[model samples]
Target: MFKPHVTVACVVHAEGKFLVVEETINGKALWNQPAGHLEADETLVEAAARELWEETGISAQPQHFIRMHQWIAPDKTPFLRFLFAIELEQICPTQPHDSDIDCCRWVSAEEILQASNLRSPLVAESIRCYQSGQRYPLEMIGDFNWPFTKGVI
Candidate 1:
Protein backbone atom coordinates (compact mmCIF):
# COMPACT_ATOMS: atom_id res chain seq x y z
CA MET A 1 0.00 0.00 0.00
CA PHE A 2 1.35 3.36 -1.00
CA LYS A 3 -1.02 5.52 1.01
CA PRO A 4 -0.67 6.42 4.66
CA HIS A 5 -3.79 7.43 6.58
CA VAL A 6 -3.73 11.14 7.40
CA THR A 7 -5.48 11.87 10.69
CA VAL A 8 -5.92 14.95 12.88
CA ALA A 9 -6.10 14.86 16.69
CA CYS A 10 -6.37 17.58 19.33
CA VAL A 11 -5.96 17.67 23.08
CA VAL A 12 -8.36 20.11 24.70
CA HIS A 13 -7.07 21.04 28.13
CA ALA A 14 -8.93 23.05 30.75
CA GLU A 15 -8.80 23.47 34.52
CA GLY A 16 -5.94 20.97 34.70
CA LYS A 17 -7.81 18.23 32.89
CA PHE A 18 -7.69 16.99 29.31
CA LEU A 19 -10.64 16.05 27.13
CA VAL A 20 -11.00 12.35 26.44
CA VAL A 21 -13.45 10.85 24.01
CA GLU A 22 -14.86 7.42 24.71
CA GLU A 23 -15.19 5.52 21.48
CA THR A 24 -16.53 2.06 20.72
CA ILE A 25 -14.10 0.02 18.72
CA ASN A 26 -14.81 -3.66 18.09
CA GLY A 27 -17.47 -3.40 20.80
CA LYS A 28 -14.94 -2.27 23.38
CA ALA A 29 -14.93 1.22 24.87
CA LEU A 30 -11.59 2.93 24.74
CA TRP A 31 -10.45 6.38 25.86
CA ASN A 32 -8.72 8.59 23.35
CA GLN A 33 -7.88 12.15 22.46
CA PRO A 34 -10.57 13.91 20.52
CA ALA A 35 -9.24 12.84 17.12
CA GLY A 36 -10.36 11.47 13.81
CA HIS A 37 -9.57 11.02 10.12
CA LEU A 38 -8.88 13.92 7.80
CA GLU A 39 -11.78 14.69 5.52
CA ALA A 40 -12.11 16.32 2.09
CA ASP A 41 -11.76 20.05 1.44
CA GLU A 42 -10.15 20.83 4.78
CA THR A 43 -6.69 21.70 5.99
CA LEU A 44 -5.05 19.86 8.86
CA VAL A 45 -6.24 22.50 11.31
CA GLU A 46 -9.80 22.24 10.07
CA ALA A 47 -9.68 18.48 10.26
CA ALA A 48 -8.40 18.62 13.84
CA ALA A 49 -11.00 21.16 14.92
CA ARG A 50 -13.80 19.28 13.20
CA GLU A 51 -12.89 16.04 14.88
CA LEU A 52 -12.85 17.70 18.27
CA TRP A 53 -16.24 19.22 17.64
CA GLU A 54 -17.74 16.07 16.19
CA GLU A 55 -16.63 13.97 19.11
CA THR A 56 -16.81 16.37 22.05
CA GLY A 57 -19.18 19.03 20.77
CA ILE A 58 -16.56 21.62 21.57
CA SER A 59 -16.71 24.50 19.16
CA ALA A 60 -13.11 25.60 19.19
CA GLN A 61 -9.84 25.75 17.32
CA PRO A 62 -6.51 24.05 17.88
CA GLN A 63 -4.13 26.89 18.68
CA HIS A 64 -0.89 25.24 19.71
CA PHE A 65 0.79 22.73 17.47
CA ILE A 66 1.91 19.81 19.63
CA ARG A 67 3.25 16.66 18.01
CA MET A 68 3.01 14.42 15.00
CA HIS A 69 3.34 10.66 15.03
CA GLN A 70 4.14 8.58 12.03
CA TRP A 71 3.45 5.00 12.89
CA ILE A 72 2.03 1.67 11.83
CA ALA A 73 -0.57 -0.09 13.93
CA PRO A 74 -0.23 -3.66 15.16
CA ASP A 75 -2.37 -4.66 12.21
CA LYS A 76 0.10 -2.88 9.91
CA THR A 77 -2.18 0.08 9.23
CA PRO A 78 -0.15 3.23 8.65
CA PHE A 79 -1.05 6.72 9.93
CA LEU A 80 0.36 10.22 9.99
CA ARG A 81 -1.13 11.77 13.13
CA PHE A 82 -1.20 15.55 13.37
CA LEU A 83 -1.76 16.65 16.96
CA PHE A 84 -2.73 20.04 18.40
CA ALA A 85 -3.48 21.59 21.78
CA ILE A 86 -6.52 23.72 22.56
CA GLU A 87 -7.68 25.56 25.65
CA LEU A 88 -11.36 25.44 26.28
CA GLU A 89 -13.38 28.45 27.40
CA GLN A 90 -15.65 26.32 29.57
CA ILE A 91 -15.29 23.04 31.36
CA CYS A 92 -18.12 21.12 29.74
CA PRO A 93 -18.79 20.59 26.06
CA THR A 94 -22.23 20.12 24.56
CA GLN A 95 -23.57 16.73 23.60
CA PRO A 96 -21.74 15.22 20.66
CA HIS A 97 -23.58 14.14 17.54
CA ASP A 98 -21.20 11.46 16.37
CA SER A 99 -22.51 8.01 17.18
CA ASP A 100 -19.03 6.61 17.50
CA ILE A 101 -18.46 8.65 20.64
CA ASP A 102 -20.11 7.29 23.75
CA CYS A 103 -19.18 10.19 26.05
CA CYS A 104 -16.64 12.89 26.81
CA ARG A 105 -14.65 12.94 30.00
CA TRP A 106 -12.36 15.48 31.59
CA VAL A 107 -9.50 13.72 33.30
CA SER A 108 -6.25 14.82 34.79
CA ALA A 109 -3.06 14.00 32.87
CA GLU A 110 -2.10 11.67 35.69
CA GLU A 111 -5.42 9.92 35.35
CA ILE A 112 -4.85 9.55 31.65
CA LEU A 113 -1.39 8.16 32.18
CA GLN A 114 -2.59 5.66 34.76
CA ALA A 115 -5.72 4.63 32.92
CA SER A 116 -5.83 1.23 31.31
CA ASN A 117 -8.37 1.88 28.54
CA LEU A 118 -6.35 4.11 26.25
CA ARG A 119 -6.92 3.72 22.55
CA SER A 120 -3.28 3.53 21.57
CA PRO A 121 0.24 4.44 22.56
CA LEU A 122 -0.04 7.59 20.52
CA VAL A 123 -2.73 8.74 22.95
CA ALA A 124 -0.29 8.75 25.87
CA GLU A 125 2.43 10.20 23.68
CA SER A 126 0.24 13.11 22.65
CA ILE A 127 -0.57 13.87 26.29
CA ARG A 128 3.07 13.79 27.29
CA CYS A 129 3.89 16.04 24.37
CA TYR A 130 1.26 18.49 25.56
CA GLN A 131 2.63 18.56 29.08
CA SER A 132 6.11 19.07 27.63
CA GLY A 133 4.88 22.59 26.72
CA GLN A 134 6.30 22.51 23.22
CA ARG A 135 4.62 24.45 20.45
CA TYR A 136 5.40 25.55 16.90
CA PRO A 137 4.11 28.43 14.82
CA LEU A 138 1.05 27.65 12.74
CA GLU A 139 2.62 29.59 9.88
CA MET A 140 4.68 26.49 9.19
CA ILE A 141 1.74 25.45 6.99
CA GLY A 142 0.24 27.21 3.97
CA ASP A 143 -2.12 26.87 1.04
CA PHE A 144 0.10 27.88 -1.80
CA ASN A 145 -0.11 26.81 -5.39
CA TRP A 146 3.45 26.78 -6.73
CA PRO A 147 2.38 27.23 -10.35
CA PHE A 148 -0.04 29.96 -9.28
CA THR A 149 2.85 31.81 -7.65
CA LYS A 150 3.90 32.94 -11.11
CA GLY A 151 4.63 36.59 -10.25
CA VAL A 152 5.78 35.95 -6.67
CA ILE A 153 8.15 33.26 -7.80
Candidate 2:
Protein backbone atom coordinates (compact mmCIF):
# COMPACT_ATOMS: atom_id res chain seq x y z
CA MET A 1 0.00 0.00 0.00
CA PHE A 2 1.20 3.44 -0.97
CA LYS A 3 -0.03 6.81 0.23
CA PRO A 4 0.55 9.61 -2.27
CA HIS A 5 1.30 13.12 -1.17
CA VAL A 6 -1.42 15.63 -2.05
CA THR A 7 -0.09 18.93 -3.33
CA VAL A 8 -1.45 22.07 -4.95
CA ALA A 9 0.07 24.22 -7.68
CA CYS A 10 -1.09 27.49 -9.18
CA VAL A 11 -0.34 28.78 -12.68
CA VAL A 12 -0.66 32.50 -12.13
CA HIS A 13 -0.87 34.34 -15.45
CA ALA A 14 -0.62 38.04 -16.13
CA GLU A 15 -0.12 39.99 -19.33
CA GLY A 16 1.94 37.70 -21.56
CA LYS A 17 3.79 35.89 -18.81
CA PHE A 18 3.30 33.40 -16.01
CA LEU A 19 4.52 33.40 -12.40
CA VAL A 20 7.33 31.03 -11.36
CA VAL A 21 9.01 30.86 -7.99
CA GLU A 22 12.67 30.01 -7.54
CA GLU A 23 13.82 27.70 -4.80
CA THR A 24 17.26 26.26 -4.08
CA ILE A 25 17.14 22.52 -3.76
CA ASN A 26 20.40 20.74 -2.92
CA GLY A 27 22.30 23.97 -3.69
CA LYS A 28 20.79 24.25 -7.17
CA ALA A 29 18.23 26.96 -7.89
CA LEU A 30 15.17 25.58 -9.68
CA TRP A 31 11.87 27.06 -10.79
CA ASN A 32 8.35 25.89 -10.09
CA GLN A 33 4.83 27.27 -9.88
CA PRO A 34 3.62 28.48 -6.51
CA ALA A 35 3.05 25.05 -4.91
CA GLY A 36 2.87 23.21 -1.64
CA HIS A 37 1.31 20.24 0.13
CA LEU A 38 -2.33 20.29 1.16
CA GLU A 39 -3.00 20.71 4.85
CA ALA A 40 -5.39 18.86 7.11
CA ASP A 41 -9.10 19.47 6.52
CA GLU A 42 -8.52 22.11 3.85
CA THR A 43 -10.33 22.11 0.54
CA LEU A 44 -8.26 21.87 -2.63
CA VAL A 45 -8.95 25.44 -3.77
CA GLU A 46 -8.38 26.76 -0.28
CA ALA A 47 -5.03 24.98 -0.22
CA ALA A 48 -4.23 26.49 -3.60
CA ALA A 49 -4.95 30.01 -2.35
CA ARG A 50 -2.97 29.51 0.83
CA GLU A 51 0.06 28.16 -1.06
CA LEU A 52 -0.01 31.06 -3.53
CA TRP A 53 0.00 33.51 -0.68
CA GLU A 54 2.67 31.69 1.29
CA GLU A 55 4.97 31.02 -1.66
CA THR A 56 4.63 34.36 -3.52
CA GLY A 57 2.88 36.67 -1.06
CA ILE A 58 0.05 37.08 -3.51
CA SER A 59 -3.45 37.02 -2.03
CA ALA A 60 -5.35 36.28 -5.19
CA GLN A 61 -7.49 33.13 -5.18
CA PRO A 62 -7.34 30.52 -7.84
CA GLN A 63 -9.76 31.35 -10.68
CA HIS A 64 -10.02 27.89 -12.20
CA PHE A 65 -8.99 24.30 -11.82
CA ILE A 66 -6.50 23.11 -14.43
CA ARG A 67 -5.60 19.44 -14.11
CA MET A 68 -4.02 16.92 -11.78
CA HIS A 69 -0.68 15.16 -12.16
CA GLN A 70 -0.07 11.72 -10.64
CA TRP A 71 3.66 11.25 -10.53
CA ILE A 72 6.46 9.47 -8.73
CA ALA A 73 9.80 11.12 -8.15
CA PRO A 74 13.20 9.53 -8.78
CA ASP A 75 13.37 8.86 -5.07
CA LYS A 76 10.06 6.97 -5.26
CA THR A 77 7.98 9.68 -3.64
CA PRO A 78 4.49 9.59 -5.09
CA PHE A 79 2.39 12.70 -5.51
CA LEU A 80 -1.13 13.70 -6.49
CA ARG A 81 -0.60 17.28 -7.56
CA PHE A 82 -3.72 19.35 -8.16
CA LEU A 83 -3.17 22.26 -10.53
CA PHE A 84 -5.06 25.57 -10.52
CA ALA A 85 -4.98 28.77 -12.58
CA ILE A 86 -5.26 32.47 -11.80
CA GLU A 87 -5.35 35.26 -14.39
CA LEU A 88 -4.37 38.75 -13.37
CA GLU A 89 -4.91 41.94 -15.34
CA GLN A 90 -1.24 42.81 -14.96
CA ILE A 91 1.86 41.42 -13.39
CA CYS A 92 2.46 42.39 -9.80
CA PRO A 93 5.69 42.63 -7.85
CA THR A 94 6.24 39.67 -5.54
CA GLN A 95 7.77 39.17 -2.11
CA PRO A 96 8.19 35.58 -1.05
CA HIS A 97 6.85 34.86 2.41
CA ASP A 98 8.20 31.31 2.39
CA SER A 99 11.85 31.13 3.29
CA ASP A 100 12.28 28.14 1.05
CA ILE A 101 11.44 30.40 -1.91
CA ASP A 102 14.46 32.38 -3.06
CA CYS A 103 12.48 34.65 -5.41
CA CYS A 104 9.67 34.94 -7.89
CA ARG A 105 9.91 35.51 -11.64
CA TRP A 106 7.41 36.31 -14.35
CA VAL A 107 8.43 34.73 -17.63
CA SER A 108 6.95 33.77 -20.93
CA ALA A 109 5.52 30.28 -21.37
CA GLU A 110 8.14 29.62 -24.01
CA GLU A 111 10.87 30.43 -21.52
CA ILE A 112 9.49 27.94 -19.02
CA LEU A 113 9.09 25.21 -21.64
CA GLN A 114 12.69 25.64 -22.74
CA ALA A 115 14.23 25.99 -19.32
CA SER A 116 16.36 23.10 -18.04
CA ASN A 117 16.34 24.19 -14.40
CA LEU A 118 12.70 23.42 -13.77
CA ARG A 119 11.96 21.67 -10.49
CA SER A 120 10.02 18.95 -12.27
CA PRO A 121 8.38 18.05 -15.58
CA LEU A 122 5.10 19.17 -14.00
CA VAL A 123 6.32 22.73 -14.26
CA ALA A 124 6.12 22.58 -18.05
CA GLU A 125 3.04 20.41 -17.89
CA SER A 126 1.27 23.16 -15.97
CA ILE A 127 2.07 25.70 -18.69
CA ARG A 128 0.84 23.34 -21.36
CA CYS A 129 -2.42 22.79 -19.47
CA TYR A 130 -2.92 26.52 -19.10
CA GLN A 131 -2.24 27.11 -22.78
CA SER A 132 -4.79 24.48 -23.69
CA GLY A 133 -7.54 26.85 -22.47
CA GLN A 134 -9.17 24.13 -20.43
CA ARG A 135 -10.58 25.06 -17.06
CA TYR A 136 -13.07 23.78 -14.51
CA PRO A 137 -15.03 25.63 -11.89
CA LEU A 138 -13.59 25.93 -8.40
CA GLU A 139 -16.49 23.83 -7.19
CA MET A 140 -15.22 20.89 -9.21
CA ILE A 141 -13.38 19.63 -6.17
CA GLY A 142 -14.85 19.90 -2.69
CA ASP A 143 -14.14 18.83 0.86
CA PHE A 144 -16.89 16.67 2.25
CA ASN A 145 -17.74 14.54 5.25
CA TRP A 146 -15.07 16.08 7.38
CA PRO A 147 -14.98 15.22 11.06
CA PHE A 148 -14.19 18.76 12.08
CA THR A 149 -13.96 22.35 10.86
CA LYS A 150 -11.12 24.96 10.67
CA GLY A 151 -8.66 22.08 10.16
CA VAL A 152 -5.78 21.16 12.42
CA ILE A 153 -3.30 23.87 13.16
Candidate 3:
Protein backbone atom coordinates (compact mmCIF):
# COMPACT_ATOMS: atom_id res chain seq x y z
CA MET A 1 0.00 0.00 0.00
CA PHE A 2 1.09 3.57 -0.62
CA LYS A 3 1.90 5.92 2.24
CA PRO A 4 -1.12 7.32 4.06
CA HIS A 5 -1.64 11.06 3.93
CA VAL A 6 -1.02 12.67 7.31
CA THR A 7 -3.49 15.30 8.46
CA VAL A 8 -4.27 17.26 11.61
CA ALA A 9 -7.67 18.05 13.14
CA CYS A 10 -8.92 19.80 16.26
CA VAL A 11 -12.15 19.84 18.25
CA VAL A 12 -12.60 23.39 19.45
CA HIS A 13 -15.02 23.30 22.33
CA ALA A 14 -16.70 25.84 24.57
CA GLU A 15 -19.88 26.05 26.68
CA GLY A 16 -20.88 22.45 25.86
CA LYS A 17 -20.59 23.02 22.13
CA PHE A 18 -17.95 22.23 19.54
CA LEU A 19 -16.82 24.37 16.65
CA VAL A 20 -17.53 23.01 13.17
CA VAL A 21 -16.67 24.22 9.74
CA GLU A 22 -19.37 24.23 7.08
CA GLU A 23 -17.74 23.79 3.72
CA THR A 24 -18.56 22.39 0.27
CA ILE A 25 -16.71 19.23 -0.48
CA ASN A 26 -17.46 17.36 -3.72
CA GLY A 27 -20.23 19.83 -4.56
CA LYS A 28 -22.09 19.28 -1.28
CA ALA A 29 -22.07 21.37 1.89
CA LEU A 30 -21.04 19.28 4.86
CA TRP A 31 -19.94 19.73 8.47
CA ASN A 32 -16.60 18.83 10.01
CA GLN A 33 -14.09 20.09 12.55
CA PRO A 34 -11.55 22.65 11.45
CA ALA A 35 -8.91 20.38 9.86
CA GLY A 36 -6.30 20.23 7.17
CA HIS A 37 -3.20 18.43 5.91
CA LEU A 38 0.12 18.59 7.81
CA GLU A 39 2.79 20.30 5.81
CA ALA A 40 6.33 19.02 5.39
CA ASP A 41 8.03 21.31 7.89
CA GLU A 42 5.37 21.74 10.59
CA THR A 43 4.69 19.62 13.64
CA LEU A 44 1.25 18.11 14.22
CA VAL A 45 0.45 20.89 16.68
CA GLU A 46 1.53 23.48 14.15
CA ALA A 47 -0.73 21.98 11.53
CA ALA A 48 -3.66 22.03 13.92
CA ALA A 49 -2.94 25.64 14.82
CA ARG A 50 -2.63 26.65 11.17
CA GLU A 51 -5.80 24.82 10.14
CA LEU A 52 -7.63 26.46 13.05
CA TRP A 53 -6.45 29.85 11.86
CA GLU A 54 -7.17 29.23 8.20
CA GLU A 55 -10.52 27.52 8.56
CA THR A 56 -11.96 29.28 11.58
CA GLY A 57 -9.76 32.38 11.90
CA ILE A 58 -9.51 31.65 15.61
CA SER A 59 -6.00 31.67 17.06
CA ALA A 60 -6.48 29.51 20.11
CA GLN A 61 -3.79 26.89 20.72
CA PRO A 62 -4.48 23.17 20.89
CA GLN A 63 -4.71 21.98 24.50
CA HIS A 64 -4.27 18.22 24.26
CA PHE A 65 -4.18 15.67 21.48
CA ILE A 66 -6.96 13.09 21.53
CA ARG A 67 -5.94 10.25 19.23
CA MET A 68 -4.46 9.24 15.93
CA HIS A 69 -7.14 7.81 13.66
CA GLN A 70 -6.27 5.85 10.55
CA TRP A 71 -8.96 5.56 7.90
CA ILE A 72 -9.05 4.23 4.39
CA ALA A 73 -11.37 5.71 1.81
CA PRO A 74 -13.72 3.41 -0.11
CA ASP A 75 -11.55 4.00 -3.16
CA LYS A 76 -8.51 2.71 -1.19
CA THR A 77 -6.93 6.09 -0.48
CA PRO A 78 -5.36 6.27 2.98
CA PHE A 79 -5.51 8.92 5.70
CA LEU A 80 -3.85 9.29 9.09
CA ARG A 81 -5.73 11.83 11.18
CA PHE A 82 -3.97 13.32 14.20
CA LEU A 83 -6.72 14.79 16.34
CA PHE A 84 -6.34 17.43 19.06
CA ALA A 85 -8.53 19.34 21.51
CA ILE A 86 -8.68 23.09 22.03
CA GLU A 87 -10.78 25.41 24.15
CA LEU A 88 -12.09 28.32 22.13
CA GLU A 89 -13.02 31.42 24.07
CA GLN A 90 -15.02 33.08 21.31
CA ILE A 91 -15.89 33.10 17.60
CA CYS A 92 -15.40 36.20 15.51
CA PRO A 93 -17.37 36.52 12.28
CA THR A 94 -14.73 38.48 10.39
CA GLN A 95 -12.05 36.02 11.57
CA PRO A 96 -13.25 33.32 9.16
CA HIS A 97 -11.19 34.46 6.17
CA ASP A 98 -10.92 31.22 4.33
CA SER A 99 -12.62 31.34 0.96
CA ASP A 100 -12.83 27.56 0.75
CA ILE A 101 -14.81 27.61 3.95
CA ASP A 102 -18.45 28.76 3.71
CA CYS A 103 -18.71 29.56 7.44
CA CYS A 104 -18.15 28.28 10.95
CA ARG A 105 -20.80 27.09 13.35
CA TRP A 106 -21.02 25.69 16.85
CA VAL A 107 -23.16 22.64 17.63
CA SER A 108 -23.66 20.21 20.42
CA ALA A 109 -21.89 16.86 20.11
CA GLU A 110 -25.19 14.98 19.94
CA GLU A 111 -26.29 17.09 17.01
CA ILE A 112 -23.10 16.17 15.21
CA LEU A 113 -23.62 12.46 15.85
CA GLN A 114 -27.19 12.64 14.52
CA ALA A 115 -26.28 14.63 11.43
CA SER A 116 -26.65 12.68 8.20
CA ASN A 117 -24.51 14.92 5.98
CA LEU A 118 -21.17 15.07 7.83
CA ARG A 119 -17.96 15.21 5.87
CA SER A 120 -16.87 11.82 7.18
CA PRO A 121 -17.43 9.38 10.02
CA LEU A 122 -14.29 10.77 11.57
CA VAL A 123 -16.29 13.85 12.43
CA ALA A 124 -18.58 11.87 14.71
CA GLU A 125 -15.68 9.89 16.13
CA SER A 126 -13.85 13.06 17.06
CA ILE A 127 -16.86 14.36 18.94
CA ARG A 128 -17.31 11.04 20.70
CA CYS A 129 -13.69 11.02 21.76
CA TYR A 130 -14.04 14.46 23.25
CA GLN A 131 -17.31 13.56 24.96
CA SER A 132 -15.89 10.30 26.33
CA GLY A 133 -13.16 12.34 28.07
CA GLN A 134 -10.05 11.52 26.07
CA ARG A 135 -6.90 13.60 25.90
CA TYR A 136 -3.07 13.36 25.76
CA PRO A 137 -0.08 15.57 26.36
CA LEU A 138 1.21 17.80 23.57
CA GLU A 139 4.75 16.82 24.50
CA MET A 140 4.07 13.47 22.86
CA ILE A 141 4.82 15.21 19.55
CA GLY A 142 8.39 16.19 18.70
CA ASP A 143 9.87 17.85 15.64
CA PHE A 144 13.44 16.84 14.88
CA ASN A 145 14.69 18.03 11.53
CA TRP A 146 11.78 17.80 9.08
CA PRO A 147 12.24 20.64 6.61
CA PHE A 148 9.58 23.24 6.00
CA THR A 149 8.80 24.81 2.64
CA LYS A 150 7.44 28.32 2.95
CA GLY A 151 4.32 30.05 1.49
CA VAL A 152 0.62 30.20 2.47
CA ILE A 153 0.31 26.55 1.40
- Which candidate has the highest TM-score of all? 2
Q: Would you list the clashing residue pairs of candidate 1?
A: none
Off by over 4 Å in 2: 145-153
Best by the lDDT measure:
2
The CA lDDT of each predicted structure is: 0.83, 0.92, 0.85
Report the lDDT tens digits of candidate 3 across residue range 80-148.
Answer: 999999875664452566888998888888899999879889999998898889688987875666577
Which of the two, 1 or 2, has more TM-score?
2
Off by over 4 Å in 3: 89-94, 145-153
Poorest 10 consecutive residues by lDDT, candidate 2: 144-153
Model 3 clashes, total count: 0
How many clashes does the backbone of model 1 have?
Answer: 0
Backbone clashes in model 2: 0
Better-scoring candidate (lDDT), 1 or 2: 2
lDDT of 1 by residue, 121-142 (tens): 8888888898889898655753
Model 3 has an lDDT value of 0.85
Write the residue-wise lDDT of candidate 2 on 1-153 in tens digits: 867899999999999999999999999999999999998778888899999999999998788888999999898889999999899999998998999999999999999999999999999999999999999987667666756563345
Model 1's alpha-carbon lDDT is 0.83
